[PDB]
């Protein structure tokens, strides 16, 4: 059952997404080498990683992450790979994503929810997944000496805000600051300022 050249008139991205959804690893492997960007989305913002997650294809997910697939790419509705993993209550995938640069506080375009809030209480594994994500959220600015990793470059909009580049480590000084629920007082190279929570991961992206 090796991989083979597709029928000439079929769209390769479509075959990629189906293979990621059903579980055909070699096909995914072939597509990834041929395409320029393993994070290539269709018209709906859906990427191979999104489908691998929903299909519970652990082998394909690891391959894609290791290959550099954008673990934070949002679809047309603002759902990132972490949001999909949570809605399936798949703790193992959530962990793999978190450990490779997932933005814990990213929110969807629809209903503006975080991954934690997308856990499905109607499906099995709900308690375990929600608890993990809740612990992940609480450990930020506390664990690893209070350090979090920027997942994107950010240019301060105000002097009281902090500028930073993708991949840099930021220390969270004030987390539960009441005056700002979506920002944290932080430190980068001796400078102190506010930074948006959704720009950070517990771990850095795979470069």
From Swiss-Prot:
Interacts with RELA NF-kappa-B subunit and with SP1 via its C-terminus part. Interacts (via SH3 domain and ANK repeats) with p53/TP53; the interaction inhibits pro-apoptotic activity of p53/TP53. Interacts with TP63 and TP73. It is linked to Arrhythmogenic cardiomyopathy with variable ectodermal abnormalities: An autosomal recessive disorder characterized by life-threatening dilated cardiomyopathy in early childhood, with or without features of inflammation on cardiac histology. There is also a variably expressed ectodermal phenotype, including wooly or wiry hair, wedged teeth, xerotic skin, and dystrophic nails. Cleft lip and palate and corneal abnormalities have also been observed. Regulator that plays a central role in regulation of apoptosis and transcription via its interaction with NF-kappa-B and p53/TP53 proteins. Blocks transcription of HIV-1 virus by inhibiting the action of both NF-kappa-B and SP1. Also inhibits p53/TP53 function, possibly by preventing the association between p53/TP53 and ASPP1 or ASPP2, and therefore suppressing the subsequent activation of apoptosis. Is involved in NF-kappa-B dependent negative regulation of inflammatory response. Changing residue 108 to P: In ARCME; uncertain significance. Highly expressed in heart, placenta and prostate. Weakly expressed in brain, liver, skeletal muscle, testis and peripheral blood leukocyte. The N-terminal region is required for cytoplasmic localization. It comes from Homo sapiens. Residues 143-205 form the SH3 domain. This is RelA-associated inhibitor. Coiled coil: none annotated. It is found in: Cytoplasm; Nucleus. ANK repeats lie at residues 44-76, 77-109. Belongs to the iASPP family.
């Amino acid at each position: 059952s090796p991989r083979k050249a597709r029928r000439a008139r079929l769209n390769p991205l479509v075959l990629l997404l189906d293979a990621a959804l059903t579980g055909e690893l070699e096909v995914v492997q072939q597509a990834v080498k041929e395409m320029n960007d393993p994070s290539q989305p269709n018209e709906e913002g859906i990427t191979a990683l999104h489908n691998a997650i929903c299909g519970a294809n652990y082998s394909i997910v690891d391959f894609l992450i290791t290959a550099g697939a954008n673990v934070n790419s949002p679809d047309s509705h603002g759902w990132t790979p972490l949001h999909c993993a949570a809605s399936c209550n798949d703790t193992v995938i959530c962990m793999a994503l978190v450990q490779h640069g997932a933005a814990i506080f990213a929110t969807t375009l629809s209903d503006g929810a975080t991954a934690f809030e997308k856990c499905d209480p109607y499906r099995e594994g709900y308690a375990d997944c929600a608890t993990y994500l809740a612990d992940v959220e609480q450990s930020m600015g506390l664990m690893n000496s209070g350090a979090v990793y920027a997942l994107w470059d950010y240019s301060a909009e105000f002097g009281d805000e902090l500028s930073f580049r993708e991949g840099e480590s930021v220390t969270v000084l004030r987390r539960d600051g009441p005056e700002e629920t979506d920002w944290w007082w932080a430190a980068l190279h001796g400078q102190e300022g506010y930074v948006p929570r959704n720009y950070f991961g517990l771990f850095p992206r795979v470069k």
